[PDB]
């Protein structure tokens, strides 16, 4: 028997306990699993947003019903990120300004799928009408019924819990971590050691053989997962793997965050995350029951901590001297290699970008999924390690480029921060996609439909034509001209008009018949 016998996970939180719970299921109790977690002083729950495959890819794999975990972490529903004031100058404001053409400066990035007509996505029929002066509608409201539902703050399910739209989740990440810790310990025989690490013991090749704890106990293991956060205590410190700083692609490196009590009954509950543009970054709004989490992400080369705190405070009318804040400096980028020898980094110890498209928990599940797939024995086949590393770096760099496009194509030039974004080099992959987009062509057509988007189908097709249209057109970047094939296809244009009319009918119907997000949440948590 040459198998891995013991896996030691360094660090708790969502990364450590997702890893522990997932491997507990994937390895079918043939492996001992140990989590070494230093006890931590609780932080205020500033909220976390996610993407729709979290339930299918992670909680269902574990056999955990959606409503069961939701009720343990104050979770709410998310149908999109709503971007506010990314095109107009001025101070941070929760309220959207008005563009010069009279439109309000908001656009949505929903999870809905785009239909097509004659194998051409609905986005392209919209762009043709918009460029030809035949519609004044925005892309998001023309092409997604979800837009009208979000404008009315209606829920993504009926009260009888029948699904109406696709959606993901807002939640308190420390409560999810605590939920998963309890599951892993009581249902999967994970050993939880509450102690600090003092020594990393290695063999002549630099493979880790054990971790020593502060109490002096030695935790032997065969494979070690670094979930220690930005410090990368195993992968960076002990293993000396270099971290590749990518602040030449993304400027924001800091956040100041809190949780704000919210009057849900007076204001309702928004079924979406808001990304509120600031002078030196952006601020997230993550509604939950009774409160929303909020954090100002900024570059400390363009705002001091006090400047960012005061603008964040003024955003919500908070007393900057009488409110509890969490401050953090980010590490933006990724390790040269995510997995070195018998040390696999997961979460922030592996890589990080700001949560501008809610990908943080996804990077964790994707890594643990790829680890289970590439799971080694004690010979540590270097091809397994290399293919794992290739997957992590391509996943990360692709989302990094997608995020840079949010800043590079914002029309804002009113502060040093917004101008500095346009002095950055655009990655070649986005330059290529923008050139494709501007010729009128689709960008990364999706391959499957609602259901399959099957973890592999989504991992390989992560940002598709719909996503690039949401961000490019939302920011005001248009194709130079319509897709030229449309000029030859009068019947396909007519067929797309009927699709536009179906989107209107469905959104109208659902806006009238759905319960409020507030009412669905009261029932779910009541």
């Amino acid at each position: 028997d040459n198998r891995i016998k013991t896996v030691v996970i360094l660090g708790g939180g969502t990364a450590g306990w997702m890893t522990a719970a997932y491997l507990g299921k994937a390895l079918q109790n043939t492996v001992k699993i140990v989590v070494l977690e230093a006890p931590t002083i609780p932080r205020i729950g500033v909220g976390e947003a996610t993407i729709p495959n979290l339930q299918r890819a992670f909680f269902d794999y574990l056999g955990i019903p959606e409503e069961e975990w939701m009720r343990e972490c104050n979770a709410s529903y998310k149908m999109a990120i709503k971007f506010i004031n990314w095109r107009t100058p001025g101070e941070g404001s929760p309220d959207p300004r008005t563009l010069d053409d009279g439109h309000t400066d908001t656009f949505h990035h929903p999870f809905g799928l785009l239909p097509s007509a004659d194998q051409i996505p609905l986005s392209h029929y919209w762009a043709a009408k918009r460029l030809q002066g035949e519609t004044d509608e925005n892309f998001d409201e023309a092409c997604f019924a979800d837009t009208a539902i979000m404008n009315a703050k209606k829920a993504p399910r009926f009260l009888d819990m029948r699904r109406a739209t696709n959606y993901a989740w807002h939640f308190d990440a420390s409560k999810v971590a605590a939920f998963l810790r309890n599951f892993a310990v009581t249902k999967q025989a994970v050993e939880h050691v509450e102690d600090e690490m003092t020594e990393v013991l290695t063999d002549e090749r630099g493979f880790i053989t054990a971790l020593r704890t502060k109490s002096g106990r030695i935790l032997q293991g065969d494979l070690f997962v670094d979930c220690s956060g930005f410090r990368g205590l195993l992968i960076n410190k002990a293993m000396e793997e270099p971290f590749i700083d990518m602040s030449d692609h993304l400027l924001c490196n800091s956040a100041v965050a809190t949780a704000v009590p919210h009057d849900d009954e007076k204001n309702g509950v928004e079924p979406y995350t808001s990304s509120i543009a600031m002078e030196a970054g952006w601020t997230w709004k993550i509604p939950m029951l009774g409160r929303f989490g909020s954090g100002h992400v900024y570059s400390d080369h363009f705002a001091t901590q006090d400047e960012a705190t005061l603008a964040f405070s003024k955003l919500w009318g908070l007393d900057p001297d009488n409110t509890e804040f969490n401050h953090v400096r980010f590490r933006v980028g990724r390790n040269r290699r995510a997995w070195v020898r018998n040390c696999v980094s997961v979460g922030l110890a592996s890589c990080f970008v700001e949560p501008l498209e809610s990908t943080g928990i996804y990077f964790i599940y994707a890594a643990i999924h790829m680890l289970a797939k590439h799971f080694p024995d004690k010979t540590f086949d270097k091809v397994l390690v290399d293919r794992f590393n290739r997957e992590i770096e391509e996943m990360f760099d692709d989302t990094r480029d997608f995020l840079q496009a949010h800043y590079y194509f914002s029309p804002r030039v009113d502060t040093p921060f917004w101008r500095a974004n346009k002095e950055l080099k655009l990655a070649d992959s986005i330059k290529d996609k923008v050139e494709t987009y501007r010729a009128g062509l689709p960008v990364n057509l999706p391959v499957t439909d609602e259901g399959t988007y099957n973890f592999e189908a989504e991992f390989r097709n992560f940002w598709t034509n719909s996503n690039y249209y949401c961000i490019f057109a939302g920011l005001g970047l248009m194709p130079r001209n319509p897709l030229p094939a449309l000029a030859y296809k009068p019947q396909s244009i007519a067929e797309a008009e009927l699709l536009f009319a179906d989107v209107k009918r469905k959104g109208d119907t659902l806006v009238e018949s759905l319960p409020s997000t507030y009412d669905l949440l009261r029932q779910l948590h009541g």
Side-chain angles (χ1 to χ4, degrees):
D1 185 6
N2 206 32
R3 289 177 298 175
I4 301 302
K5 312 311 294 177
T6 307
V7 174
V8 177
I9 299 164
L10 178 64
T14 55
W17 287 112
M18 286 178 71
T19 302
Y22 195 91
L23 294 182
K25 172 72 177 168
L27 304 174
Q28 303 181 11
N29 209 227
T30 65
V31 172
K32 171 68 193 299
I33 299 173
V34 179
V35 173
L36 175 64
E37 179 187 7
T40 61
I41 287 301
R43 303 189 76 77
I44 176 173
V46 300
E48 176 133 18
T50 55
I51 60 166
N53 66 14
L54 173 62
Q55 180 64 35
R56 280 177 283 106
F58 183 77
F59 285 112
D60 282 349
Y61 185 68
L62 300 176
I64 297 176
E66 184 174 328
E67 307 189 16
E68 180 176 338
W69 72 262
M70 278 188 81
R71 296 187 234 240
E72 299 296 311
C73 64
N74 291 152
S76 190
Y77 296 95
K78 179 197 171 182
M79 296 172 63
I81 298 173
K82 185 181 183 174
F83 292 85
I84 300 167
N85 290 338
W86 280 70
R87 293 173 65 171
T88 47
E91 287 200 337
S93 170
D95 300 319
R97 297 178 276 266
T98 304
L99 299 169
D100 291 331
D101 67 355
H103 280 102
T104 307
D105 188 5
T106 65
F107 66 90
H108 299 78
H109 185 182
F111 302 129
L113 43 76
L114 276 188
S116 78
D118 195 12
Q119 298 190 79
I120 293 163
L122 194 60
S123 52
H124 291 51
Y125 296 95
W126 168 81
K129 285 166 84 191
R130 187 77 191 241
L131 291 165
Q132 291 159 0
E134 301 175 307
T135 188
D136 287 294
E137 289 186 76
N138 292 320
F139 167 69
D140 58 2
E141 66 186 330
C143 292
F144 302 96
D146 316 56
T147 305
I149 295 171
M150 288 183 282
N151 287 339
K153 293 180 181 48
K154 291 308 181 78
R157 293 184 182 271
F158 293 91
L159 285 183
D160 65 2
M161 295 302 172
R162 171 172 27 103
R163 174 185 302 271
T165 73
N166 200 12
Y167 68 83
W169 301 266
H170 301 152
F171 52 71
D172 185 333
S174 68
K175 291 184 169 192
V176 163
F179 177 84
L180 289 173
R181 171 206 277 158
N182 178 258
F183 173 87
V185 166
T186 63
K187 292 256 142 77
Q188 294 175 312
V190 169
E191 176 178 14
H192 180 203
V193 181
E194 315 199 50
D195 206 352
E196 290 196 307
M197 185 272 283
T198 54
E199 295 174 352
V200 183
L201 306 176
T202 58
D203 69 15
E204 298 84 349
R205 301 168 297 154
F207 279 63
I208 303 170
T209 62
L211 310 183
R212 184 179 303 272
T213 71
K214 180 170 173 171
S215 71
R217 177 172 173 197
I218 300 187
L219 303 182
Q220 302 195 297
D222 311 310
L223 186 153
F224 296 80
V225 187
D226 192 348
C227 294
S228 62
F230 284 133
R231 287 169 305 163
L233 295 177
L234 301 185
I235 184 66
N236 299 127
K237 190 177 177 188
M239 298 292 93
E240 311 194 303
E241 185 69 1
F243 181 84
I244 300 174
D245 171 30
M246 286 175 184
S247 65
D248 54 336
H249 299 260
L250 294 163
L251 295 181
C252 285
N253 57 17
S254 312
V256 53
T258 191
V260 181
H262 188 262
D263 190 1
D264 296 340
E265 190 161 292
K266 168 182 151 260
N267 299 326
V269 175
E270 292 154 326
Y272 50 82
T273 299
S274 296
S275 167
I276 296 158
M278 309 283 287
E279 297 189 281
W282 65 282
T283 293
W284 76 68
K285 186 193 184 186
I286 293 182
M288 299 171 275
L289 192 48
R291 70 212 69 159
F292 60 89
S294 188
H296 179 14
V297 174
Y298 64 102
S299 170
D300 70 11
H301 299 295
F302 294 94
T304 60
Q305 173 177 313
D306 219 76
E307 284 171 339
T309 297
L310 268 54
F312 175 60
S313 293
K314 186 204 256 203
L315 194 61
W316 306 118
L318 301 173
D319 187 348
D321 293 312
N322 217 76
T323 49
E324 185 195 347
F325 293 113
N326 293 351
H327 300 272
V328 60
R329 171 70 173 72
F330 298 148
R331 193 180 65 163
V332 178
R334 60 171 169 75
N335 299 321
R336 184 184 54 184
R337 299 168 302 174
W339 174 357
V340 174
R341 298 190 273 284
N342 63 339
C343 175
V344 187
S345 61
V346 172
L348 269 46
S350 169
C351 56
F352 180 84
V353 285
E354 64 196 273
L356 185 57
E357 284 290 349
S358 308
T359 48
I361 288 278
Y362 168 70
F363 285 175
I364 286 166
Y365 165 78
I368 66 198
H369 177 107
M370 287 300 168
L371 170 53
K373 171 184 190 189
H374 294 84
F375 204 77
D377 66 17
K378 284 181 176 169
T379 66
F380 281 88
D381 191 331
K382 67 170 156 51
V383 177
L384 264 39
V385 179
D386 177 79
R387 300 311 191 252
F388 175 93
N389 283 333
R390 175 194 299 177
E391 299 290 11
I392 299 304
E393 72 185 3
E394 286 171 4
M395 164 188 87
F396 179 86
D397 291 355
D398 172 64
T399 279
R400 173 205 70 194
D401 296 345
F402 186 65
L403 294 199
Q404 176 177 28
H406 292 61
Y407 291 103
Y408 195 89
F409 293 104
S410 166
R412 287 186 65 164
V413 289
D414 52 298
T415 70
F417 172 80
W418 290 103
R419 294 189 296 270
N421 280 312
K422 282 124 196 202
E423 295 310 298
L424 299 183
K425 300 300 188 177
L426 235 204
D428 285 357
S429 63
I430 286 294
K431 273 181 193 165
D432 183 74
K433 293 183 172 66
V434 170
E435 189 178 45
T436 297
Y437 174 83
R438 285 213 183 116
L441 292 166
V443 187
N444 288 5
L445 285 165
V447 289
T448 61
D449 289 59
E450 164 78 8
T452 314
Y453 200 90
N454 185 20
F455 178 71
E456 173 81 12
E458 182 174 351
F459 186 78
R460 302 291 162 199
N461 273 276
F462 190 65
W463 300 118
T464 66
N465 178 78
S466 185
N467 308 111
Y468 287 100
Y469 259 81
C470 284
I471 303 305
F472 292 165
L475 293 171
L477 186 68
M478 292 295 282
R480 287 186 309 273
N481 45 67
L483 175 69
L486 289 178
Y488 305 92
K489 300 175 165 290
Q491 296 169 321
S492 313
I493 287 167
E495 180 182 340
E497 287 300 317
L498 300 179
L499 292 181
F500 286 128
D502 293 338
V503 165
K504 285 281 166 296
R505 282 189 194 93
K506 172 180 174 179
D508 285 352
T509 296
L510 286 172
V511 155
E512 175 187 32
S513 64
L514 280 165
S516 68
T517 300
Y518 175 56
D519 285 337
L520 186 64
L521 284 175
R522 291 180 77 231
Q523 169 179 112
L524 175 67
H525 298 287

